[PDB]
Amino acid sequence: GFVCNTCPEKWINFQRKCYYFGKGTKQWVHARYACDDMEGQLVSIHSPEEQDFLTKHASHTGSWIGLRNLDLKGEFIWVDGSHVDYSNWAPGEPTSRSQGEDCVMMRGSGRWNDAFCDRKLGAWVCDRLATCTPP
């Protein structure tokens, strides 16, 4: 009821959320359900502070994040239903003439790239809300 920084075992706290830096070869949808079945969601990024934390723990070979183009014409939404306010797209991204590249990955640099959803990445990040210690 005061300090919201408690996380489950294997999850790392940053501000009022918990992050799971997953490993294992998964397509976007596979990583989506891996987070879901673990009481989390693929990571939603809403500030440069949150992004800097992610970049610090980001897999050098790339990670799936919770961003997906839904209407197939440039409208990206996070798995939790939230819209893009903060963005950390790599230059030229997202590409307009890249039909099928609907799923978003985070590079070792922390910058985002759009991708074919059936692409197998060796890492993926989940998030959930932290629990709180009462006063």
UniProtKB/Swiss-Prot annotation:
Domain C-type lectin residues, every copy: 6-128
Disulphide bridges: C4-C132, C7-C18, C35-C126, C103-C117
Binding sites annotated in the UniProt record for Ca(2+): E93, T95, N113, D114
Protein's name according to its UniProt entry: Low affinity immunoglobulin epsilon Fc receptor soluble form
Gene name in the database record: FCER2
Included stretch of the parent chain: 157 to 291 of 321
